[PDB]
Design a protein around this ligand. Structure first.
Ligand code: FAD
Ligand code: FAD
Ligand code: FAD
Ligand code: TZD
Ligand code: TZD
Ligand code: G87
Ligand code: G87
Ligand code: K
Ligand code: K
Ligand code: MG
Ligand code: MG
Lengths: 600, 600, 218
């Protein structure tokens, strides 16, 4: 009777592949990134010429993975990856580890050899469940077609709840080829208050903030996981009159044009932001995990907030969805567990409205003034400075009546992009932060461009980073993704040569990879190519770059052996930073010249 | 007293990095493949401008991994990889899994975050020991500099003994930066009979072979792991008058010009070889693991040898170094554990010399005659057939007074290379067999070319495979490796479209990746480019290809939608194969044309 | 409960954090989670093939294990098969009680400490019907020398090993099955037996068996 109402037979007669297809539809998947192979053919046959989602074909499964990541961060939806067994699956390991570190909802479907062949070292067999265990929230191997819809639901649910992250679902070929012959629980054929412990924590947190004389908001990626996040962040900052700093992954969560913006904090963050957090009596941590790039020397981190906590007049208020990241690095004075945006809705009305903080904002404005992102400007005849390039792109990009999304590679160009872009909108900085994967920039841009077809998507890339995955240029063309790749060509692994200049007496050990001709490369890939070689080409070259309505590769020759500053050296407190100094740079240039015999 | 003789203080005062450097020397490492990064900088500083080995810089760590694999298979030495933490390390996972499946001695050294930061989700931290566990023979994280020499010795020993395979050694930054302050056991500062159970097995095996009327040697990669291997294989085949078939990985272990050669067996192997092994009363398995590509339907494999075993007049004699692979797939009548070459030295003198086997070799010669690698020849106006291309390359390559080493990508081109090359020398087929990694061809060739600077090294590649890792072209130039890349451009994932033609009614689901302009690509990479577009350019184009003394990319336009034959379909016995038939191919072409509306 | 009781039964562990078991459910849950819970023609064809092999056998033996006990009808169908095709039955240690040892067709327990009659019979049988038993190393003795007559018969297409096994992991793990019949042994016996020819007598085979039983008491 009611048993017929709780069981569903609508999938009976379908192959596992066809069931996969139907479940993608029910999960509102509109894009799949993948690459075919023997073990996953039953699924590829099922999705053949599907009009239900766009399929994006990379040149390499790592490309699929990073594309799905870019897609996920741009769209707020899970990025879906479909690959074959063996090397198809192991090729997604770096994107999976990447997604885990950066909290990216990734759902990876990997073909697998038939169940009858597992553990025999079969053709193209990898133990992907074993291998991917450490770099996924969760994984599973489907053992029969009857449980396939359930595993799919489970995968999407886990990927998108708590701290978002990657999941892998292993699909044996005989399972996806097999036909469902039995009815299954109808709940498996479909996708899907505040605890007073937390409610009391929130009230307690509000009382702490209402005492604060030097508050600061420390906002991260978590605030981006809800569309109302940035709005409520602004509402809080406005109401209680609080300066806001963000992590690298929080960039765009707060309007940096706002006077209350302290810009990015951390190792390569603003000295103003770093100074402010070191002197704040109350730190409001909104969806940020106190990563070691942000805290500096942990024992010396946030001295004023720890003092205030001990004296019952401040401390750290940590709004965090994942209990694992609460009290992992720094002790929270109050832990507010759950979605930061939801908890802010309860928090803000308990927070007293504050008109002015003369003394605090006097310090903040003074710090902002004395700590700009200073660097050595161009001189007559010199190459374009990489910092100036970023400014040019940022200024000209904001000119179009389109959303602007930025992805990056990893290295100096990445930090300069973070520093010198003006960040104003959520989900516009798409960068590999936790794992820091070189090669991320181009495929992430393709994924973001597919998520946001009407956006300007700029990959600010390094020459060494771009080399990692440049084959995916063909993928952009085939996908119809008019991405804009800007290669900051300093002909070096800049971030490593900076460390080698600094700590290894200018011994540049294998940090200069030879580059292809990027213009002939672009041409070979059927992509528009622009090369900027001198200061006088900067403005017009960047305009042509942004005006392009097709995929375009811009190469910019930029100054070499230029350090990213400010810098908080490892072991040092956040407010014990190295600032840019003109004479210091001159001396460093002379020293480098002498030690390398004029080679660098 | 003697304590001073057993302890060594010669490393005291050295950093972990410097100790690493010294241990590479002591392990006679002459080549390192790697890519720098923060966590591994102390090691890179130590090997800075080292004249003790050649350093090879890829564009991607996967490149380093596959290069090291190519190097190892060409040289018989372990391939050494040096990468940084996080993504540097996870990027070597596919090469590691590749090396495990193909028994390749790979020693991977990965930088790691400081010991003080492990398990904190630190900057660029991956659990590479956890991740790589399933795809290494063994791995370890060094915890202090005092144990670094021991772990290094242990790594090389494990990688190169038993069945060779990949090992990973994780190197925390603070360990490699730290200085050895204490003396260490002198045995750790240096690198490094037959059981009568085996001796009796050998005698028993000889008696079985001396009864055999239809013997066959089934030779694999294991015979290549000793320089005397091929010689002793030949000695055995000559003495007892035995036809020889090899696996894909055994290609070159036996002179295929020899009348006793049955060529390659298996799914895409010769129908003559497959027929012979199905009818043999005694199978001598020499360093081969009865992979599922070779056995066909296991329950129907080697019927005559199983019958002979049951009747005490034959069976399977398995010479295998790894106990795990003895009796894993098929029951060995006699298991001869240990190095196949060493055991052959004992085996052969117990084997009776045999002049003639009229009846057996009559069958073999008849099978060889009726089962050539037939295919549809070129017709006027048609594109070059991929099989003909391979023949041309093989014929012209054998013309030079240089060793010729072949690497491949994965797909149809790979099997056609295997089939249509004439294999005569050991360690000349370097191909991804167990994992089957597309993208392997180019970096493997670079590694092989570095191992063998005076060899002609040809990467027979697919267009889709080549796309995976084509960025490593720059790496070949920078390394001074004059590799010869031949892209068989059928503008398709040929091996997948073959399965889709065959099993999915010509539904080509996402199996046509767009290709770059390979000639402009080569130009952008500073590599010589040659394009062959028609039959009349084949000979002269291949000559120019082989005559080149610089890195060169040859693109050949070849016929599309051509199946690799013969084929043993999954589920079928080895002697239940599909043969090429002209009329059948014509009908298949018409059917494909009709179903795809003339598109394919 | 589902995993513990399906396939080959086995242990499962469910870890219950104190704050979870102390916590109170505040939200509705899928109603399917509040409640507990044909034959593939690949197997159907295997069964038919197995029957044809047994119908050729001149020296059959049933090798019955714990699996036959996992269904209440198991022992009944085992007896029905043994009676119909006139087959001597040996069991593992874990199969003890699956077959009435008072029955003349009982060979008692086989293996390291099993009856020499049972061990002799299985070594000389041309067809071995493995019913819910996993060919453990206490049972097979030297694996390479195990069941010589059944391997010979298989090679000659007149016998071999018919393995009724619910867990694919244990199929072809130790010895090659001539025919693998995947699934519940009792359910598959219901299909198997009617395809099996009824046999009145096996004079020569049962003469050996009775002689072995007589010369090999405990
Ligand atoms: C070369 C390089 C240099 C770098 N230098 C810097 C630097 O100077 N400054 C800097 O900031 N970063 C830097 N990083 C990046 C740094 O390593 C981290 O990736 C970054 O700081 C993490 O930012 P995050 O905490 O906001 O994001 P995440 O790492 O994603 O952490 C977000 C936190 O919020 C939680 N969360 C997620 N969703 C929610 C929700 N809905 N509600 C509540 N909580 C939620 C998560 O569980 C997590 O704890 C650098 C990276 C590279 C490659
Ligand atoms: C598209 C594709 C199609 C393929 N089709 C075929 C095909 O048709 N035919 C074919 O043969 N292959 C084919 N393969 C390759 C196949 O998957 C295996 O990789 C290959 O057959 C394994 O060959 P092998 O056993 O000789 O080498 P290995 O896999 O390396 O095994 C060697 C064995 O020898 C042992 N051994 C190693 N060293 C020693 C020693 N010193 N002494 C004794 N023993 C030792 C090893 O432990 C191991 O058991 C194909 C691959 C691909 C990608
Ligand atoms: C000191 C000592 C001495 C021993 N000596 C002997 C000896 O001489 N002889 C002997 O027999 N044992 C001996 N053993 C026991 C031996 O080690 C094994 O435990 C025993 O032989 C296994 O019997 P089994 O295969 O029937 O049961 P199991 O180990 O439980 O295996 C049952 C098989 O049937 C399968 N199965 C389960 N349910 C079903 C189903 N519904 N349908 C189909 N298949 C199913 C299972 O997956 C499994 O493969 C000894 C043990 C000890 C401690
Ligand atoms: C895959 C990988 N390998 C190595 C590193 C280590 N690494 C390396 C080698 C960097 C140099 C990047 O060079 P680039 O040209 O892309 O950028 P810049 O010159 O602007 O710094 S940055 C960095 O963190 C990494 N992050 N990712
Ligand atoms: C990294 C990876 N992804 C997917 C596969 C699956 N796969 C795919 C997609 C093949 C087609 C290879 O295309 P190709 O152009 O390189 O070669 P051919 O056209 O000559 O077959 S072959 C093969 O096994 C694989 N082996 N490796
Ligand atoms: C699409 O390209 C290819 C190439 C191919 O062999 C070279 N195969 N082989 C197949 S299969 O039928 O044998 N299935 C299969 C696979 Cl994928 C891995 C392991 C095992 C044991 C099996 Cl049974 N499917 C394939 N697809
Ligand atoms: C060479 O390029 C770079 C770039 C860089 O930060 C962006 N760093 N940071 C460093 S470090 O001194 O802080 N060491 C370090 C590393 Cl690598 C990972 C994790 C932790 C906790 C530490 Cl302590 N070394 C670096 N090298
Ligand atoms: K900024
Ligand atoms: K050949
Ligand atoms: Mg650079
Ligand atoms: Mg191709």
């Amino acid at each position: 009777k009611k048993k017929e109402q709780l069981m569903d037979d609508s999938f009976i007669g379908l192959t596992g592949g066809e069931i996969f297809h139907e479940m993608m539809l029910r999960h509102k998947v509109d894009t799949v990134f993948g690459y075919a192979g023997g073990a996953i053919l039953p699924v590829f046959d099922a999705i053949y010429n599907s009009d239900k989602f766009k399929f994006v074909l990379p040149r390499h499964e790592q490309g699929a993975g990073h594309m799905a990541e870019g897609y996920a961060r741009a769209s707020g939806k899970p990025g879906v990856v479909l690959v074959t067994s063996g090397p198809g699956a192991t090729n997604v390991i770096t994107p999976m580890a990447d997604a885990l570190m950066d909290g990216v909802p990734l759902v990876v479907f990997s073909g697998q050899v038939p169940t009858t062949a597992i553990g025999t070292d079969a053709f193209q067999e990898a133990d992907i469940v074993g291998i991917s265990r450490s770099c996924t929230k969760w994984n599973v191997m489907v053992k029969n077609v009857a449980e396939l819809p359930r595993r799919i639901n489970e995968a999407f649910e886990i990927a998108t709840t708590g701290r978002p992250g990657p999941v892998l679902v292993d699909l044996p070929k005989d399972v996806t080829a097999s036909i469902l012959r039995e009815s299954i629980p109808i709940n498996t054929t479909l996708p899907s208050a505040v605890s007073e412990f937390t409610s009391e924590a929130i009230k307690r947190a509000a009382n702490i903030l209402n005492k604060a004389k030097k508050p600061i908001i420390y906002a991260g990626a978590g605030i981006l996981n809800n569309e109302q996040g940035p709005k409520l962040l602004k509402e809080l900052a406005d109401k209680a009159n609080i300066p806001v700093t963000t992590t690298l992954q929080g960039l765009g969560a707060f309007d940096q044009r706002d006077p209350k913006s302290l810009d990015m904090l951390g190792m390569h963050g603003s000295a103003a932001a770093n100074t402010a957090i070191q002197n704040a009596d109350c730190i409001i941590a909104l969806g940020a995990r106190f990563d070691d790039r942000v805290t500096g020397n942990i024992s010396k981190f946030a001295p004023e907030a720890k003092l205030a906590a001990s004296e019952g007049r401040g401390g750290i208020l940590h709004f965090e969805i994942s209990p694992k990241n609460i009290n992992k690095v720094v002790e929270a004075t109050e832990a507010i567990e759950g979605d930061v945006t939801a908890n802010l809705q309860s928090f803000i009305p308990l927070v007293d409205s504050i008109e002015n903080r003369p003394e605090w904002f006097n310090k903040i404005n003074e710090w902002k003034k004395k700590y700009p992102y200073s660097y050595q400007l161009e001189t007559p005849g010199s190459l374009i400075k990489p910092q100036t390039l970023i400014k040019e792109i940022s200024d000209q990009a904001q000119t179009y009546n389109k959303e602007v999304i930025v992805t990056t590679g990893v290295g100096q160009h990445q930090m300069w992009a973070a520093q010198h872009f003006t960040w104003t909108q959520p989900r516009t900085m798409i960068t590999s932060g936790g794992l820091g994967t070189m090669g991320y920039g181009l495929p992430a841009a393709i994924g973001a461009q597919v998520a946001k077809p009407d956006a300007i998507v700029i990959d600010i890339d390094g020459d060494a980073s771009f080399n990692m995955t440049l084959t995916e240029l063909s993928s952009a063309v085939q996908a119809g993704a008019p991405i804009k790749v800007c290669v900051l060509n300093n002909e070096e692994q800049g971030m490593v040569t900076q460390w080698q200049s600094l700590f290894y007496e200018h011994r540049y050990s294998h940090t200069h990879q030879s580059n292809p001709d990027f213009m002939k490369l672009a041409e070979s890939m059927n992509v528009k190519g622009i090369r900027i070689t001198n200061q006088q080409e900067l403005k017009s070259g960047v305009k042509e770059f942004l005006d392009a309505t097709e995929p375009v590769l811009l190469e910019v020759i930029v100054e070499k052996k230029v350090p990213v500053l400010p810098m908080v050296p490892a072991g040092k407190a956040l407010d014990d930073f190295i600032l840019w100094d003109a004479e210091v740079e001159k001396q460093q240039n002379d020293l480098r010249k002498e030690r390398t015999g004029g080679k660098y």
